[PDB]
Design a protein around this motif. Structure first.
Motif, short mmCIF file in Angstrom:
data_model
loop_
_atom_site.label_atom_id
_atom_site.label_comp_id
_atom_site.label_asym_id
_atom_site.label_seq_id
_atom_site.Cartn_x
_atom_site.Cartn_y
_atom_site.Cartn_z
N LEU B 58 0.82 -1.20 0.00
CA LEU B 58 0.00 0.00 0.00
C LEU B 58 0.86 1.26 0.00
CD1 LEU B 58 -2.73 1.36 0.12
CD2 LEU B 58 -2.72 1.05 2.60
N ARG B 62 1.03 4.28 -2.93
CA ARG B 62 0.83 5.69 -2.62
C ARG B 62 2.06 6.53 -2.95
NH1 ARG B 62 -2.41 5.40 3.25
NH2 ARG B 62 -4.33 4.53 2.36
N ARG E 115 -43.49 -53.47 4.61
CA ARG E 115 -42.33 -54.33 4.84
C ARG E 115 -41.96 -54.40 6.32
NH1 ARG E 115 -39.71 -56.04 0.09
NH2 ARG E 115 -40.20 -54.77 -1.76
N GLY E 116 -42.97 -54.32 7.19
CA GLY E 116 -42.72 -54.38 8.62
C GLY E 116 -41.98 -53.18 9.17
N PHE E 118 -41.71 -48.98 10.23
CA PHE E 118 -42.56 -48.06 10.96
C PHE E 118 -41.87 -46.71 11.08
CE2 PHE E 118 -40.23 -48.01 14.95
CZ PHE E 118 -39.51 -49.18 14.88
N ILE E 120 -42.13 -42.85 13.55
CA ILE E 120 -42.57 -42.30 14.83
C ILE E 120 -43.36 -41.03 14.53
CG2 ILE E 120 -41.90 -41.44 17.08
CD1 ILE E 120 -39.41 -43.10 16.92
N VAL E 163 -7.37 5.71 5.41
CA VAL E 163 -7.07 4.59 6.28
C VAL E 163 -5.61 4.20 6.11
CG1 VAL E 163 -9.46 3.85 5.97
CG2 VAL E 163 -7.63 2.73 4.68
N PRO F 8 -37.15 -57.18 9.77
CA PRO F 8 -37.30 -55.88 10.45
C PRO F 8 -37.32 -56.05 11.96
CG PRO F 8 -38.84 -56.07 8.63
CD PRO F 8 -38.24 -57.43 8.81
N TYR F 10 -38.84 -54.72 15.32
CA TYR F 10 -39.91 -53.95 15.93
C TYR F 10 -39.44 -53.37 17.26
CZ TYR F 10 -42.82 -56.53 12.58
OH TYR F 10 -43.35 -57.08 11.43
N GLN F 11 -39.55 -52.06 17.41
CA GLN F 11 -39.18 -51.43 18.66
C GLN F 11 -40.23 -51.74 19.72
OE1 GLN F 11 -39.06 -47.17 18.64
NE2 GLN F 11 -41.29 -46.96 18.59
#
Ligand code: K
Ligand code: MG
Ligand code: MG
Ligand code: MG
Ligand code: MG
Ligand code: MG
Ligand code: MG
Ligand code: MG
Ligand code: MG
Ligand code: MG
Ligand code: MG
Ligand code: MG
Ligand code: MG
Ligand code: MG
Ligand code: MG
Ligand code: MG
Ligand code: MG
Ligand code: MG
Ligand code: MG
Ligand code: MG
Ligand code: MG
Ligand code: MG
Ligand code: MG
Ligand code: MG
Ligand code: MG
Ligand code: MG
Ligand code: MG
Ligand code: MG
Ligand code: MG
Ligand code: MG
Ligand code: MG
Ligand code: MG
Ligand code: MG
Ligand code: MG
Ligand code: MG
Ligand code: MG
Ligand code: MG
Ligand code: MG
Lengths: 148, 140, 191, 97, 166, 15, 26, 95
Positions: B58, B62, E115-116, E118, E120, E163, F8, F10-11
């Motif tokens: 810089l 300048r 297919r069995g 599930f 929640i 700056v 499968p 089952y829970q």
RNA sequence: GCUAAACCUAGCCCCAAACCCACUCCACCUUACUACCAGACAACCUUAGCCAAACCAUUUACCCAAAUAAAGUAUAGGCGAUAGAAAUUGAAACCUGGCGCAAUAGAUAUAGUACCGCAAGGGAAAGAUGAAAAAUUAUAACCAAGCAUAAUAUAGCAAGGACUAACCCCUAUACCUUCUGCAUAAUGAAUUAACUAGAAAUAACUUUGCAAGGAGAGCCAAAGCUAAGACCCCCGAAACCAGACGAGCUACCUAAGAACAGCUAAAAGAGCACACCCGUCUAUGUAGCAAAAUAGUGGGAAGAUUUAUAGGUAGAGGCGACAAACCUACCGAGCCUGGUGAUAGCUGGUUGUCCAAGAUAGAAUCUUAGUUCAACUUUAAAUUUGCCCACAGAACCCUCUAAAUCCCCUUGUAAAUUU
RNA sequence: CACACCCAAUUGGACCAAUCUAUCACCCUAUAGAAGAACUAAUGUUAGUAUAAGUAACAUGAAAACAUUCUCCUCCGCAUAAGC
RNA sequence: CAUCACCUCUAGCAUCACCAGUAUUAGAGGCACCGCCUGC
RNA sequence: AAACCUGCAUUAAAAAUUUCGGUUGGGGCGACCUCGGAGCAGAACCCAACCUC
């Protein structure tokens, strides 16, 4: 532990196993170095330097007959009947500076050690003790508490 | 004796405090934040070399900008101020180029004068005496 | 530590009830592979490396080291003006308040350890005075120990106790190595 | 979460009760008592641990040969399994040989 | 659980000085465990946010969502409560200040698949919170114009410094 | 190519 | 409930700092 | 190697080391030469001379055999008229 | 500010001590929990195997009645892995205790209940106000992820340097693990909270005690001996064996039953064609209505048919019109429990801070996915040379021919060797 | 100006969170002893909640006085047996 | 695959299968009717 | 006299336990695994596996 292998998994082979080749402790022929080691008799050496050292400090009195009991009493020797010890052997180390008239009894004695004691007017005798009797001689007090 | 960590809360707040200004889930999830805070700290350490490098670039831009206002180039100004035993760094020269325009024009004139002395010196075979500003102060 | 017995013990994965059945087949379920429900990774399973009590921390320092510990303990108390010699432990009254005021007047300390030669010859005056106190303890000469002496700021000894300690402690400095334990008869033991 | 919002009740400890004020007493029963008693005889606890120390395998082996005939059937079965496992672990697994 | 919204109505302020301005009346009311999705409820709460009490009711009366009837019942009992208990002179003067939905305690059921397999399923519940402030609703913020954009842009050009220098 | 079938799981219903 | 006072004590001081920020005293 | 026995809980000794090697109390191990009784008809007298002699193990082998035997084999013995009695102690040894 | 978050007991663990329980009435071995009729049926018999031996085939520890010591000794043993005495010696022995756990802990347990399985069997989850609930005007505040409060404005591992300023400018190829080398489009991780992984001997070292002696019998000792400190993980197979439980599905069989319209035909393992049984082709479906179904189209449908009921054959087996079919929705050998924390040289994981030293010669091996030794590396100690290198010196051949290397005083240097 | 403060495996150190115990200490500490002694990772275990997503999917013939009637389907129905 | 038909092999006999049977039988197998041709 | 039972031998039946050594892309057919020398590291030592002889 390193990277994988038996080292990290704690499945290192037994001690002496060499990866498959015949182990060093196996390829050597057998020789009777230690055969019948537990039936050989052992005798704690007793130097005349040690004997004179005990006499000069009063730990072993020369005015009375000296047996294996008195040596153990003065802590001059350490007899272990359980370790196939059969007594003490009087060795000739320090026979030049020995000067005392004692009546000592030792299970074994060398020819020179006998001459050194008899030169000063002492008496040396060799007697045999069985392993059962040897433990009684070394520590009479523990035997006297057995009621036998 | 069963020992359990009772102050694990403070062990994660010493890391999540540095990520409060991030965007997304990596400002509140410790698993995500720890990998971003560490990278932020790595960049922080490596940026101290670029900051010094970018400052000098810089300054050079300048200084070059102010030199072209006087019809000079950056190699002509820095090279000929050194031969005048004027040891001003780029940081000061850039400051003089912005806040002391009449002082920078003085250095631009000095560098231009010293530049012309070298050209006259190279034309001769050494018989001619050196330039007025070409003299070098010796320190023993 | 020597008399400490730690009774803490947990159940390993082989001692947790059940867990002999494999939860799901090795492949296909798409979940992590497990062989039991009582492994340390599972909730309610065994502990991998837990306590296996009861555990004993018993170890014996050499007899001379333990006897030298008493001498240093006695020396530190005397050098710091915390040891006081007495002739007898007979108080004029069996009042525990009298003992507290007597120790505060002489500026002994918050805790004072009183030592007598034997347990059956302790005067009744000091027994009734100390039994109701918490920082003033009465022990026989044989019950002397480093932990009790360091715990109590002030140590109080009688003349028979001092003679007893020197006879017991100095016997270690000049003695033969034991052929058999000293509990068995010897030529000149006990003194 | 995982840290309590209220201070636990203060832990008042009596440093001068019967057990603490008399801890360490008679630990010199042998040296100061003509060696009639042994300080390890003061130890109380399991009959297979009085005046003895060893690792887990040795503690299980010593416990089995002293009180094994008095243990419950399930407890004795567990002890035998532990000895079997510890024997294999110590004598076949590890970093050093 | 947390029930702070109920307690926000029990705070009593010190009497105002004669020179102090009139303090608008704040009414905090809520209904708990509404059998409705909080995500769906948010659209209805966002709609009446900032509206007047009467304007909010009109929008909810012709809205086909199930929560529109539920929210309207909450506003009617909140408007009645303000006059009856909170010392509000005009029931229509109130406007909606804060209106948001929150998650409630939810149940968990099993939804059977083929297919069995599930899934929640959860029976979602939501809470609705409303705050009423006495006084006309504040005018909406006028859209930013070119003069406002021009003034801000020039201000940015005037606040810039040199700056990385002195 | 042996047919592998994973039943499968089952829970438990209490959940 | 994990045994330990130092962690619980340290958390109370942190909570007090938050209380000051939320409701600063006059 | 059994580091902990199942009945005593103490380290055992490999008997394949006791029947082949001799330990001098100084720390050295004395062994025989592999093949001093095999095919002696095809070996030169010089080769047989160095086969029927006792030799010492090296640093690694001696360390290996120490771990495979207990302290009963490392104690000092006082056998009467022992052929190797004078070899149990080093003389004029530095470093 | 919602969801939530917090709590201290319930009880439990390990010891000590002492040897425990089971008739209130009624019912309970038949189809248990069933008031009330000729039976004759009767129990006992080596464990094996996994595993170790880096395979395996002999073999491989399992309290047998006193701690210690003799002693890991005598012995045994593919004399390999490993196993292992005795004579002899000989101690204390006071329940009411805890450097045990505190609701994912401690028993599985609030309960062997709910629930799952035909059965043997497997096996949970959770509770929390206060002195007072006959105070509910309650039991303040603050805390995970997830949300709301408050959707978004060029551009990019989302950060850093910065800046008056969020961004704009410049710079920067996510983490772990596994490989020579991963931004790698190789493995693992949605995220939060809790839980979850280095256990020990000889020797050596370090620090005390005592010292030719040490040690609270036994043991070691040519300065040793005693005591302490300090080093050796977690999850996962397919399997094998023993003892049980299963033929209410299915394979076949036994007992005694039932069913098959109409038509053509004929006394038909005949034809067409319902009920019924089977499942050829196509399509739908593929977390589906269904862990094998639906619609249509098909084969058989008076027979070696279909089918209800009860019984039998059980895993070293049964049964089979052999498909290595079926034997309770994973049968080239069922399932459950136990041996079992089986084993895995294989995969994965292995949790505070900071500093320091630190990489590539080989040999053997049922061995090259491993291990052992050497080399290298580390620490401690001891000692004196170490590296660099001046000449001199190191073969003739098949005729000749390279960069160099070895050795190596000085010198420059500070290392090297040994324990 | 400061200076032990940029290597894998491994090795040597110096510190150390929390906990229990001994003794201190008394708005949370000290010196020691001891140990179930520290998790960004094992398709980890349990629990909570996101993402996909308000998505896939699921459902009630019509009018009406809610008396009733109308439209359509019926390969079903009733009973026994067995089971529950 | 089974299947009538054909063919091979084994067995001279009873009180729990075969069987309450007896070589025109029973069992273990091959092949797949029949018809023609062929070995011996 | 004969049988049954028992012990020990001898055939057979039916079973029992256990294992598939390495090297050459794979298979087939063959070769190979230890030691010495050469191409083979031109000059101390060592070192080119596979390969060619
Ligand atoms: K194997
Ligand atoms: Mg390796
Ligand atoms: Mg188990
Ligand atoms: Mg099993
Ligand atoms: Mg397993
Ligand atoms: Mg548990
Ligand atoms: Mg080991
Ligand atoms: Mg189903
Ligand atoms: Mg094996
Ligand atoms: Mg195998
Ligand atoms: Mg529990
Ligand atoms: Mg549980
Ligand atoms: Mg939050
Ligand atoms: Mg950019
Ligand atoms: Mg990508
Ligand atoms: Mg890759
Ligand atoms: Mg993933
Ligand atoms: Mg086997
Ligand atoms: Mg096997
Ligand atoms: Mg059936
Ligand atoms: Mg027909
Ligand atoms: Mg037909
Ligand atoms: Mg069939
Ligand atoms: Mg076939
Ligand atoms: Mg086949
Ligand atoms: Mg099945
Ligand atoms: Mg394993
Ligand atoms: Mg391997
Ligand atoms: Mg370094
Ligand atoms: Mg530096
Ligand atoms: Mg501490
Ligand atoms: Mg832990
Ligand atoms: Mg965590
Ligand atoms: Mg995880
Ligand atoms: Mg979509
Ligand atoms: Mg749809
Ligand atoms: Mg409908
Ligand atoms: Mg056929």
């Amino acid at each position: 532990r390193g990277h994988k292998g038996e080292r990290q998994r704690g499945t290192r082979p037994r001690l002496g196993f060499e990866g498959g080749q015949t182990p060093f402790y196996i390829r050597i022929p057998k020789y009777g170095f230690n055969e019948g080691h537990s039936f050989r008799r052992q005798y704690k050496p007793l130097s005349l330097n040690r004997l004179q050292y005990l006499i000069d400090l009063g730990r072993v009195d020369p005015s009375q007959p000296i047996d294996l009991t008195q040596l153990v009493n003065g802590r001059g020797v350490t007899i272990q009947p359980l370790k196939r010890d059969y007594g003490v052997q009087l060795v000739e180390e320090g026979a030049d500076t020995f000067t005392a008239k004692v009546n000592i009894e030792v299970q074994l004695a060398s020819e020179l050690a006998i001459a050194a004691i008899e030169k000063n007017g002492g008496v040396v005798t060799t007697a045999f003790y069985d392993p059962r009797s040897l433990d009684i001689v070394c520590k009479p007090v523990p035997f006297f508490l057995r009621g036998q | 004796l069963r020992n359990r960590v009772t102050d694990r809360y403070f062990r994660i707040q010493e890391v999540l405090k540095h990520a409060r200004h991030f965007r997304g889930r990596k400002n509140r999830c410790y698993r995500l934040a720890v990998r971003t805070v560490i990278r932020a700290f790595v960049k922080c350490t490596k940026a101290r070399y670029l900051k010094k490098k970018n400052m000098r670039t810089l300054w050079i831009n300048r200084i070059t900008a102010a030199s072209q206002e006087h019809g000079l180039k950056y190699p002509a100004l820095i090279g000929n101020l050194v031969k005048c035993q004027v040891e001003l760094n780029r940081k000061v020269l850039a400051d003089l180029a912005i806040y002391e325009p009449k002082t920078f024009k003085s250095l631009a004139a000095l560098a231009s004068r010293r530049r012309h002395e070298g050209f006259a010196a190279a034309l001769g075979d050494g018989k001619e005496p050196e330039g007025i500003f070409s003299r070098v102060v010796q320190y023993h | 530590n020597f008399k400490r017995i730690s009774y803490a013990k947990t159940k390993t994965r082989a001692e947790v009830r059940g867990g002999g059945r494999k939860p799901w087949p090795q492949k296909g379920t798409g979940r992590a592979r497990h062989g039991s429900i009582r492994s340390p990774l599972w909730r309610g399973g065994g502990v991998a490396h837990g306590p296996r009590g009861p555990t004993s921390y018993y170890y014996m320092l050499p007899m001379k080291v333990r006897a030298l510990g008493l001498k240093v303990a006695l020396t530190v108390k005397l050098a710091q003006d915390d040891l006081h010699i007495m002739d007898s432990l007979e108080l004029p009254t069996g009042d525990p308040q009298y003992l507290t005021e007597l120790a505060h007047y002489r500026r002994w300390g918050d805790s004072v350890l009183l030592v007598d030669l034997t347990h059956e010859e302790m005067p009744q005056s000091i027994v009734e005075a100390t039994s109701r106190l918490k920082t003033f303890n009465l022990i026989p000469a044989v019950g002397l120990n480093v932990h009790s002496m360091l715990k109590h700021q002030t140590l109080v000894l009688t003349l028979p106790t001092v003679a007893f300690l020197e006879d017991k402690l100095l016997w270690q400095d000049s003695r033969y190595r034991p052929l058999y334990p000293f509990s068995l008869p010897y030529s000149d033991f006990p003194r | 979460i995982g840290i309590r919002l209220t201070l636990p009740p203060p832990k008042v400890v009596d440093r001068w009760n019967e057990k603490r004020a008399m801890f360490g007493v008679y630990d010199n029963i042998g040296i100061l008592g003509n060696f009639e008693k042994h300080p390890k005889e003061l130890i109380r606890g399991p009959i297979w641990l009085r005046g003895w120390k060893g690792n887990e395998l040795q503690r299980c082996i010593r416990k089995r040969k002293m009180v094994g005939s008095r243990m419950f059937a399930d407890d004795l079965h567990n002890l035998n399994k532990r000895i079997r496992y510890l024997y294999k672990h110590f004598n076949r697994h590890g970093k050093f040989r | 659980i947390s029930r702070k919204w109920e307690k926000k109505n029990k705070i009593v302020y010190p009497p105002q000085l004669p020179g102090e301005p009139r303090r608008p009346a704040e009414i905090y009311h809520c209904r708990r465990q509404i059998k409705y999705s909080k995500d769906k409820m948010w659209y209805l709460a966002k709609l009446i946010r900032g509206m007047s009490i009467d304007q909010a009711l009109a929008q909810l009366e012709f809205n086909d969502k199930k929560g529109a009837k539920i929210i309207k019942e909450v506003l009617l009992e909140a408007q009645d409560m303000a006059v009856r208990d909170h010392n509000v002179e005009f029931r229509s003067n109130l406007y909606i200040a804060e209106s948001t939905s929150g998650r409630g305690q939810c149940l968990k059921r099993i939804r059977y698949h083929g297919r069995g397999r599930f899934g929640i399923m959860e029976k979602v519940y939501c809470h609705y919170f409303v705050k009423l402030v006495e006084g006309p609703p504040p005018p909406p913020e006028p859209p930013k114009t070119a003069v406002a954009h021009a003034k801000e842009y020039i201000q940015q050009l005037r606040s810039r410094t040199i700056v990385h220098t002195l | 190519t042996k047919k592998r079938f994973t039943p499968p799981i089952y829970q438990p219903k209490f959940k | 409930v994990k045994k330990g006072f130092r962690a619980a004590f340290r958390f109370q001081k942190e909570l007090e700092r938050q209380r000051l920020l939320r409701c600063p005293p006059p | 190697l059994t580091y902990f026995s199942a009945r005593k809980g103490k380290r055992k000794t490999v008997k394949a080391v006791i029947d082949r090697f001799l330990r001098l109390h100084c720390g050295l191990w004395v062994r025989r030469k592999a093949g001093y009784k095999k095919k002696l008809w095809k070996k030169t007298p010089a080769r047989k001379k160095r086969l029927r002699e006792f030799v010492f193990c090296n640093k690694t082998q001696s360390k290996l055999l120490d771990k495979m035997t207990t302290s009963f084999w490392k104690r000092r013995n006082w056998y009467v008229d022992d052929p190797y009695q004078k070899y149990h102690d080093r003389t004029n040894l530095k470093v």
